[PDB]
Scaffold this active site. Structure first.
Site, PDB file in Angstrom:
ATOM      1  N   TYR A   1      -4.933 -18.048   7.407  1.00  0.00           N
ATOM      2  CA  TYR A   1      -5.711 -16.834   8.450  1.00  0.00           C
ATOM      3  C   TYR A   1      -5.145 -17.388   9.877  1.00  0.00           C
ATOM      4  O   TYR A   1      -4.716 -17.751  10.339  1.00  0.00           O
ATOM      5  CB  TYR A   1      -7.263 -17.568   8.532  1.00  0.00           C
ATOM      6  CG  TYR A   1      -8.691 -17.472   9.530  1.00  0.00           C
ATOM      7  CD1 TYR A   1      -9.309 -15.326   9.199  1.00  0.00           C
ATOM      8  CD2 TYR A   1      -8.912 -17.820  10.763  1.00  0.00           C
ATOM      9  CE1 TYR A   1     -10.205 -15.089   9.883  1.00  0.00           C
ATOM     10  CE2 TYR A   1      -9.458 -16.737  11.796  1.00  0.00           C
ATOM     11  CZ  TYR A   1     -10.331 -15.707  11.041  1.00  0.00           C
ATOM     12  OH  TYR A   1     -11.372 -15.010  11.658  1.00  0.00           O
TER      13      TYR A   1
ATOM     14  N   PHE B   1     -10.851  -9.741  15.713  1.00  0.00           N
ATOM     15  CA  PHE B   1      -9.336  -9.710  15.630  1.00  0.00           C
ATOM     16  C   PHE B   1      -9.336 -10.515  14.277  1.00  0.00           C
ATOM     17  O   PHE B   1     -10.078 -11.701  14.670  1.00  0.00           O
ATOM     18  CB  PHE B   1      -8.926 -10.139  16.804  1.00  0.00           C
ATOM     19  CG  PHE B   1      -6.890 -11.075  16.317  1.00  0.00           C
ATOM     20  CD1 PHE B   1      -6.329 -11.565  16.179  1.00  0.00           C
ATOM     21  CD2 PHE B   1      -6.316  -9.587  16.979  1.00  0.00           C
ATOM     22  CE1 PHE B   1      -5.315 -12.617  15.582  1.00  0.00           C
ATOM     23  CE2 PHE B   1      -4.744 -10.218  16.064  1.00  0.00           C
ATOM     24  CZ  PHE B   1      -4.255 -11.573  15.622  1.00  0.00           C
ATOM     25  N   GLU B   2      -8.784 -10.618  13.591  1.00  0.00           N
ATOM     26  CA  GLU B   2      -8.335 -11.435  11.926  1.00  0.00           C
ATOM     27  C   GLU B   2      -6.663 -10.655  11.426  1.00  0.00           C
ATOM     28  O   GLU B   2      -6.713  -9.739  11.207  1.00  0.00           O
ATOM     29  CB  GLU B   2      -9.276 -11.708  11.209  1.00  0.00           C
ATOM     30  CG  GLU B   2     -10.491 -11.879  11.530  1.00  0.00           C
ATOM     31  CD  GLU B   2     -11.582 -12.129  10.662  1.00  0.00           C
ATOM     32  OE1 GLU B   2     -12.296 -13.005  10.423  1.00  0.00           O
ATOM     33  OE2 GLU B   2     -11.415 -11.254   9.465  1.00  0.00           O
ATOM     34  N   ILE B   3      -6.032 -12.083  11.519  1.00  0.00           N
ATOM     35  CA  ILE B   3      -5.310 -11.581  10.420  1.00  0.00           C
ATOM     36  C   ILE B   3      -5.633 -12.174   9.653  1.00  0.00           C
ATOM     37  O   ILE B   3      -5.135 -13.977   9.423  1.00  0.00           O
ATOM     38  CB  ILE B   3      -3.566 -11.939  11.151  1.00  0.00           C
ATOM     39  CG1 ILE B   3      -3.540 -10.371  12.039  1.00  0.00           C
ATOM     40  CG2 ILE B   3      -2.749 -11.643  10.381  1.00  0.00           C
ATOM     41  CD1 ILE B   3      -1.708 -11.134  12.801  1.00  0.00           C
TER      42      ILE B   3
END
Ligand code: NA
Ligand code: NA
Length: 365
Positions: free
Chosen positions: A197, A262-264
Protein backbone atom coordinates in the site's frame (compact mmCIF):
# COMPACT_ATOMS: atom_id res chain seq x y z
CA UNK A 1 12.56 17.18 13.92
CA UNK A 2 9.44 15.50 12.41
CA UNK A 3 7.78 15.53 15.88
CA UNK A 4 4.63 17.32 17.08
CA UNK A 5 4.31 21.10 17.55
CA UNK A 6 2.26 22.29 20.57
CA UNK A 7 0.87 25.75 21.51
CA UNK A 8 -2.67 21.89 22.28
CA UNK A 9 -1.38 20.00 19.21
CA UNK A 10 -0.88 22.25 16.18
CA UNK A 11 0.59 20.05 13.41
CA UNK A 12 4.14 19.12 12.47
CA UNK A 13 7.13 21.09 13.77
CA UNK A 14 9.46 20.49 10.82
CA UNK A 15 7.89 18.86 7.77
CA UNK A 16 10.24 16.30 6.06
CA UNK A 17 8.74 17.50 2.76
CA UNK A 18 10.97 20.58 3.13
CA UNK A 19 14.04 18.32 2.67
CA UNK A 20 15.31 17.85 -0.90
CA UNK A 21 12.98 15.09 -2.07
CA UNK A 22 14.07 12.66 -4.76
CA UNK A 23 13.23 9.20 -6.00
CA UNK A 24 13.18 5.98 -4.02
CA UNK A 25 16.33 3.82 -3.94
CA UNK A 26 16.87 0.66 -5.97
CA UNK A 27 16.00 -0.20 -9.54
CA UNK A 28 13.33 2.00 -11.16
CA UNK A 29 11.48 1.27 -14.41
CA UNK A 30 11.86 4.25 -16.78
CA UNK A 31 9.71 5.21 -19.76
CA UNK A 32 12.74 6.22 -21.93
CA UNK A 33 14.32 2.76 -21.43
CA UNK A 34 11.24 0.59 -22.03
CA UNK A 35 8.33 -0.17 -24.29
CA UNK A 36 5.42 1.71 -22.65
CA UNK A 37 3.64 2.46 -25.95
CA UNK A 38 -0.14 2.68 -25.36
CA UNK A 39 -1.09 -0.01 -27.91
CA UNK A 40 1.98 -2.28 -27.62
CA UNK A 41 1.26 -5.95 -26.93
CA UNK A 42 4.74 -6.41 -25.40
CA UNK A 43 4.86 -3.42 -23.04
CA UNK A 44 6.65 -3.08 -19.74
CA UNK A 45 3.30 -2.60 -17.90
CA UNK A 46 2.41 -4.94 -15.04
CA UNK A 47 -1.22 -5.95 -14.32
CA UNK A 48 -2.39 -2.64 -12.85
CA UNK A 49 -4.99 0.04 -13.47
CA UNK A 50 -5.91 3.59 -12.53
CA UNK A 51 -9.40 3.33 -10.98
CA UNK A 52 -12.10 5.82 -10.01
CA UNK A 53 -15.59 5.67 -8.47
CA UNK A 54 -17.21 8.60 -10.24
CA UNK A 55 -20.61 9.93 -11.32
CA UNK A 56 -21.48 11.44 -14.74
CA UNK A 57 -22.09 14.79 -13.00
CA UNK A 58 -18.43 14.90 -11.78
CA UNK A 59 -17.08 14.73 -15.38
CA UNK A 60 -15.55 18.24 -15.52
CA UNK A 61 -13.66 17.70 -12.24
CA UNK A 62 -12.55 14.23 -13.42
CA UNK A 63 -11.15 15.73 -16.66
CA UNK A 64 -9.06 18.26 -14.69
CA UNK A 65 -7.73 15.40 -12.55
CA UNK A 66 -6.98 13.17 -15.58
CA UNK A 67 -5.02 16.04 -17.18
CA UNK A 68 -2.80 16.32 -14.10
CA UNK A 69 -2.21 12.58 -13.68
CA UNK A 70 -1.53 12.14 -17.42
CA UNK A 71 0.81 15.16 -17.64
CA UNK A 72 2.79 14.17 -14.54
CA UNK A 73 2.90 10.41 -14.99
CA UNK A 74 0.53 8.38 -17.19
CA UNK A 75 1.34 9.98 -20.59
CA UNK A 76 4.72 8.17 -20.25
CA UNK A 77 3.50 4.82 -18.89
CA UNK A 78 -0.02 4.52 -20.38
CA UNK A 79 -1.72 2.35 -17.79
CA UNK A 80 -5.46 1.85 -18.40
CA UNK A 81 -8.26 3.81 -16.64
CA UNK A 82 -11.23 1.89 -15.21
CA UNK A 83 -14.24 3.98 -14.17
CA UNK A 84 -16.91 2.66 -11.79
CA UNK A 85 -20.41 3.91 -11.08
CA UNK A 86 -23.69 2.52 -9.73
CA UNK A 87 -25.46 4.05 -12.80
CA UNK A 88 -24.47 3.74 -16.53
CA UNK A 89 -21.92 6.19 -17.93
CA UNK A 90 -23.17 8.60 -20.63
CA UNK A 91 -21.63 8.70 -24.11
CA UNK A 92 -20.38 12.22 -23.32
CA UNK A 93 -18.53 10.86 -20.25
CA UNK A 94 -16.95 8.11 -22.39
CA UNK A 95 -15.93 10.47 -25.22
CA UNK A 96 -14.51 13.18 -22.95
CA UNK A 97 -12.54 10.79 -20.70
CA UNK A 98 -10.99 8.73 -23.53
CA UNK A 99 -9.94 12.01 -25.22
CA UNK A 100 -7.61 12.81 -22.27
CA UNK A 101 -5.50 9.62 -22.46
CA UNK A 102 -3.72 7.42 -25.03
CA UNK A 103 -4.39 4.41 -22.80
CA UNK A 104 -7.51 2.24 -22.91
CA UNK A 105 -10.48 3.42 -20.80
CA UNK A 106 -13.08 1.01 -19.42
CA UNK A 107 -16.53 1.87 -18.11
CA UNK A 108 -17.97 -0.41 -15.46
CA UNK A 109 -21.14 -0.57 -13.42
CA UNK A 110 -21.13 -1.58 -9.76
CA UNK A 111 -23.44 -4.60 -9.36
CA UNK A 112 -26.56 -4.31 -7.16
CA UNK A 113 -25.18 -6.81 -4.63
CA UNK A 114 -22.06 -4.60 -4.15
CA UNK A 115 -24.13 -1.40 -3.69
CA UNK A 116 -27.54 -2.13 -2.12
CA UNK A 117 -27.39 -2.34 1.67
CA UNK A 118 -27.29 -6.00 2.78
CA UNK A 119 -30.51 -7.75 3.92
CA UNK A 120 -29.71 -7.60 7.63
CA UNK A 121 -29.60 -3.76 7.72
CA UNK A 122 -32.79 -2.21 9.06
CA UNK A 123 -33.48 0.98 7.07
CA UNK A 124 -35.53 2.67 9.85
CA UNK A 125 -32.56 2.26 12.24
CA UNK A 126 -30.35 3.62 9.46
CA UNK A 127 -32.56 6.73 9.05
CA UNK A 128 -32.69 7.37 12.82
CA UNK A 129 -28.92 7.22 13.34
CA UNK A 130 -28.41 9.27 10.11
CA UNK A 131 -30.68 12.01 11.50
CA UNK A 132 -28.49 12.17 14.65
CA UNK A 133 -25.20 12.35 12.66
CA UNK A 134 -26.78 15.07 10.48
CA UNK A 135 -27.60 17.07 13.65
CA UNK A 136 -24.14 16.59 15.21
CA UNK A 137 -21.53 16.53 12.42
CA UNK A 138 -20.01 19.81 11.18
CA UNK A 139 -20.94 20.75 7.59
CA UNK A 140 -22.59 17.40 7.01
CA UNK A 141 -26.05 16.22 6.01
CA UNK A 142 -26.35 12.46 5.76
CA UNK A 143 -26.99 10.52 2.55
CA UNK A 144 -27.30 6.75 2.11
CA UNK A 145 -24.97 7.02 -0.90
CA UNK A 146 -22.05 8.18 1.32
CA UNK A 147 -22.38 4.97 3.31
CA UNK A 148 -22.64 2.85 0.14
CA UNK A 149 -19.44 4.50 -1.22
CA UNK A 150 -17.58 3.77 2.03
CA UNK A 151 -18.74 0.15 2.06
CA UNK A 152 -17.81 -0.25 -1.65
CA UNK A 153 -14.28 1.10 -1.14
CA UNK A 154 -13.95 -0.96 2.06
CA UNK A 155 -15.00 -4.41 0.81
CA UNK A 156 -16.38 -4.48 -2.75
CA UNK A 157 -14.07 -2.77 -5.30
CA UNK A 158 -11.55 -5.63 -5.10
CA UNK A 159 -14.39 -8.16 -5.77
CA UNK A 160 -15.49 -6.45 -9.00
CA UNK A 161 -15.17 -8.77 -12.12
CA UNK A 162 -13.40 -6.04 -14.14
CA UNK A 163 -10.45 -6.18 -11.69
CA UNK A 164 -10.14 -10.00 -11.53
CA UNK A 165 -6.91 -10.22 -13.57
CA UNK A 166 -5.38 -7.10 -11.97
CA UNK A 167 -3.06 -7.10 -8.95
CA UNK A 168 -2.45 -3.33 -8.37
CA UNK A 169 -4.65 -0.27 -8.42
CA UNK A 170 -4.17 3.49 -8.14
CA UNK A 171 -7.39 4.99 -6.80
CA UNK A 172 -8.09 8.47 -8.17
CA UNK A 173 -10.84 10.83 -6.98
CA UNK A 174 -12.63 13.19 -9.35
CA UNK A 175 -11.41 16.53 -8.02
CA UNK A 176 -7.72 16.37 -7.10
CA UNK A 177 -4.44 17.87 -8.26
CA UNK A 178 -1.06 16.30 -8.99
CA UNK A 179 1.88 18.69 -8.91
CA UNK A 180 5.07 16.65 -9.59
CA UNK A 181 6.48 14.79 -12.56
CA UNK A 182 7.10 11.18 -11.60
CA UNK A 183 9.63 9.44 -13.88
CA UNK A 184 9.33 5.81 -12.77
CA UNK A 185 6.67 3.12 -12.97
CA UNK A 186 5.01 3.32 -9.52
CA UNK A 187 3.20 0.03 -10.01
CA UNK A 188 6.39 -1.91 -10.73
CA UNK A 189 8.10 -0.01 -7.90
CA UNK A 190 5.46 -1.62 -5.64
CA UNK A 191 5.69 -5.04 -7.29
CA UNK A 192 9.50 -5.31 -7.25
CA UNK A 193 9.54 -4.53 -3.51
CA UNK A 194 6.40 -6.61 -2.66
CA UNK A 195 4.71 -3.47 -1.30
CA UNK A 196 1.13 -3.61 -0.12
CA UNK A 197 0.00 0.00 0.00
CA UNK A 198 1.03 3.55 -0.75
CA UNK A 199 -0.28 6.82 0.70
CA UNK A 200 0.42 10.59 0.53
CA UNK A 201 -1.59 12.13 3.42
CA UNK A 202 -2.27 10.87 6.98
CA UNK A 203 -5.12 12.53 8.96
CA UNK A 204 -7.24 12.39 12.11
CA UNK A 205 -10.90 11.45 11.50
CA UNK A 206 -14.14 12.60 13.10
CA UNK A 207 -14.69 10.24 16.12
CA UNK A 208 -18.50 10.63 15.68
CA UNK A 209 -18.29 8.61 12.41
CA UNK A 210 -16.50 5.64 14.09
CA UNK A 211 -17.48 5.23 17.76
CA UNK A 212 -17.79 1.37 17.76
CA UNK A 213 -15.26 0.66 14.98
CA UNK A 214 -12.38 -0.07 17.37
CA UNK A 215 -14.57 -2.02 19.81
CA UNK A 216 -15.79 -4.16 16.84
CA UNK A 217 -12.20 -4.56 15.61
CA UNK A 218 -11.11 -5.87 19.03
CA UNK A 219 -14.01 -8.37 18.97
CA UNK A 220 -12.78 -9.58 15.57
CA UNK A 221 -9.19 -9.90 16.86
CA UNK A 222 -10.28 -11.87 19.95
CA UNK A 223 -12.05 -14.37 17.66
CA UNK A 224 -9.05 -14.54 15.24
CA UNK A 225 -5.84 -14.33 17.31
CA UNK A 226 -3.57 -15.67 14.52
CA UNK A 227 -4.46 -12.82 12.10
CA UNK A 228 -2.45 -10.02 13.82
CA UNK A 229 0.84 -9.43 11.97
CA UNK A 230 4.19 -9.21 13.74
CA UNK A 231 5.20 -5.91 12.06
CA UNK A 232 1.94 -4.19 13.02
CA UNK A 233 0.93 -0.56 13.62
CA UNK A 234 -0.77 -1.02 17.04
CA UNK A 235 1.17 1.94 18.51
CA UNK A 236 -0.14 4.23 15.76
CA UNK A 237 -3.69 2.84 15.79
CA UNK A 238 -3.98 3.25 19.62
CA UNK A 239 -1.94 6.43 20.10
CA UNK A 240 -3.36 9.10 22.44
CA UNK A 241 -0.28 11.36 22.73
CA UNK A 242 -1.34 14.06 20.19
CA UNK A 243 -5.10 14.34 20.50
CA UNK A 244 -6.19 12.23 23.51
CA UNK A 245 -9.82 13.41 23.24
CA UNK A 246 -10.06 11.82 19.78
CA UNK A 247 -8.77 8.50 21.06
CA UNK A 248 -11.20 8.58 24.01
CA UNK A 249 -14.17 9.53 21.79
CA UNK A 250 -13.35 6.71 19.32
CA UNK A 251 -13.00 4.25 22.25
CA UNK A 252 -9.31 3.36 21.87
CA UNK A 253 -8.61 4.18 18.18
CA UNK A 254 -6.56 7.34 17.44
CA UNK A 255 -8.81 7.90 14.39
CA UNK A 256 -5.65 8.33 12.29
CA UNK A 257 -5.81 7.02 8.75
CA UNK A 258 -4.15 7.04 5.39
CA UNK A 259 -6.25 9.50 3.42
CA UNK A 260 -7.82 7.00 1.04
CA UNK A 261 -8.93 9.34 -1.76
CA UNK A 262 -5.33 8.61 -2.89
CA UNK A 263 -4.22 4.95 -2.76
CA UNK A 264 -1.78 2.76 -4.65
CA UNK A 265 -2.45 -0.77 -3.42
CA UNK A 266 -2.11 -4.53 -3.79
CA UNK A 267 -5.62 -5.88 -4.50
CA UNK A 268 -4.49 -9.29 -3.26
CA UNK A 269 -3.97 -7.90 0.26
CA UNK A 270 -7.63 -6.86 0.47
CA UNK A 271 -8.77 -10.13 -1.20
CA UNK A 272 -6.75 -12.07 1.39
CA UNK A 273 -8.25 -14.14 4.21
CA UNK A 274 -7.43 -11.69 7.00
CA UNK A 275 -8.60 -8.38 5.53
CA UNK A 276 -11.66 -9.80 3.83
CA UNK A 277 -12.78 -11.63 7.03
CA UNK A 278 -12.31 -8.29 8.83
CA UNK A 279 -14.48 -6.51 6.25
CA UNK A 280 -17.23 -9.16 6.53
CA UNK A 281 -17.17 -8.90 10.34
CA UNK A 282 -17.67 -5.12 10.05
CA UNK A 283 -20.35 -5.66 7.39
CA UNK A 284 -22.36 -7.88 9.77
CA UNK A 285 -21.89 -5.44 12.67
CA UNK A 286 -23.79 -2.77 10.67
CA UNK A 287 -21.52 0.21 11.35
CA UNK A 288 -21.14 1.08 7.66
CA UNK A 289 -24.81 2.11 7.90
CA UNK A 290 -25.65 2.69 11.60
CA UNK A 291 -22.46 4.73 11.92
CA UNK A 292 -20.45 6.22 9.01
CA UNK A 293 -17.40 3.99 9.01
CA UNK A 294 -15.10 5.45 6.36
CA UNK A 295 -13.06 3.28 3.99
CA UNK A 296 -9.99 5.26 5.12
CA UNK A 297 -10.09 4.19 8.78
CA UNK A 298 -11.21 0.66 7.76
CA UNK A 299 -8.31 0.30 5.26
CA UNK A 300 -5.90 1.83 7.76
CA UNK A 301 -6.92 -0.49 10.61
CA UNK A 302 -6.83 -3.50 8.25
CA UNK A 303 -3.32 -2.60 7.07
CA UNK A 304 -2.17 -1.77 10.59
CA UNK A 305 -3.31 -5.14 11.99
CA UNK A 306 -2.85 -7.58 9.06
CA UNK A 307 -0.15 -6.17 6.75
CA UNK A 308 3.59 -5.95 7.18
CA UNK A 309 4.22 -2.26 8.03
CA UNK A 310 7.53 -2.43 6.12
CA UNK A 311 5.42 -2.99 2.96
CA UNK A 312 3.46 0.28 3.45
CA UNK A 313 5.07 3.25 1.71
CA UNK A 314 4.76 7.03 1.97
CA UNK A 315 4.78 8.36 -1.60
CA UNK A 316 6.37 11.63 -0.48
CA UNK A 317 7.44 12.35 -4.08
CA UNK A 318 3.87 12.40 -5.48
CA UNK A 319 2.70 16.00 -5.13
CA UNK A 320 -0.99 15.79 -4.26
CA UNK A 321 -3.99 17.89 -3.21
CA UNK A 322 -7.56 16.98 -2.32
CA UNK A 323 -9.21 20.01 -0.70
CA UNK A 324 -8.11 21.17 1.85
CA UNK A 325 -4.87 19.15 2.34
CA UNK A 326 -1.57 18.70 0.53
CA UNK A 327 1.46 16.53 0.12
CA UNK A 328 3.92 18.96 -1.55
CA UNK A 329 7.57 17.84 -1.66
CA UNK A 330 10.59 20.08 -2.18
CA UNK A 331 11.61 18.94 -5.66
CA UNK A 332 12.39 20.65 -8.96
CA UNK A 333 9.96 18.15 -10.55
CA UNK A 334 7.02 19.95 -8.84
CA UNK A 335 5.23 23.19 -9.51
CA UNK A 336 2.23 25.17 -8.21
CA UNK A 337 2.29 23.86 -4.63
CA UNK A 338 4.07 25.19 -1.54
CA UNK A 339 6.54 22.63 -0.13
CA UNK A 340 5.56 21.46 3.36
CA UNK A 341 2.30 23.47 3.58
CA UNK A 342 -0.14 20.87 4.94
CA UNK A 343 -3.39 22.83 4.51
CA UNK A 344 -5.13 25.76 2.82
CA UNK A 345 -7.81 27.54 4.88
CA UNK A 346 -8.20 28.52 8.51
CA UNK A 347 -5.39 27.69 10.94
CA UNK A 348 -7.57 25.25 12.95
CA UNK A 349 -6.96 22.78 10.05
CA UNK A 350 -3.28 22.33 11.04
CA UNK A 351 -4.09 19.89 13.87
CA UNK A 352 -5.63 17.37 11.40
CA UNK A 353 -2.16 16.14 10.34
CA UNK A 354 -1.42 12.75 11.98
CA UNK A 355 1.99 12.15 10.34
CA UNK A 356 3.94 13.07 13.49
CA UNK A 357 2.33 10.05 15.15
CA UNK A 358 2.68 7.79 12.09
CA UNK A 359 6.35 8.76 11.62
CA UNK A 360 7.13 8.10 15.31
CA UNK A 361 5.31 4.75 15.62
CA UNK A 362 5.79 3.28 12.11
CA UNK A 363 8.23 5.44 10.11
CA UNK A 364 8.88 7.55 7.02
CA UNK A 365 9.76 4.72 4.61
NA1 NA B 1 9.80 4.04 -24.19
NA1 NA C 1 -24.55 18.50 10.37
Amino acid sequence: SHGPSFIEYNGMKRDPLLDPTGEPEGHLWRADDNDYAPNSAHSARTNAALISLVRNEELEDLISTMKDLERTWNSKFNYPWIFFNDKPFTEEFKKRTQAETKAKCYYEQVPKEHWDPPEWINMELFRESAAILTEQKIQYSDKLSYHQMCRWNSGMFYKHPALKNYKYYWRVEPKVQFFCNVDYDVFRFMEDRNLTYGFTINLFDDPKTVPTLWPETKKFLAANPSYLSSNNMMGWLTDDSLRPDHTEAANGYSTCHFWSNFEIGDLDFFRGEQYDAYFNHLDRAGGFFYERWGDAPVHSIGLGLFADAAKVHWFRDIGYNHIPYYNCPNSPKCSKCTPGQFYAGAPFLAKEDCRPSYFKHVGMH
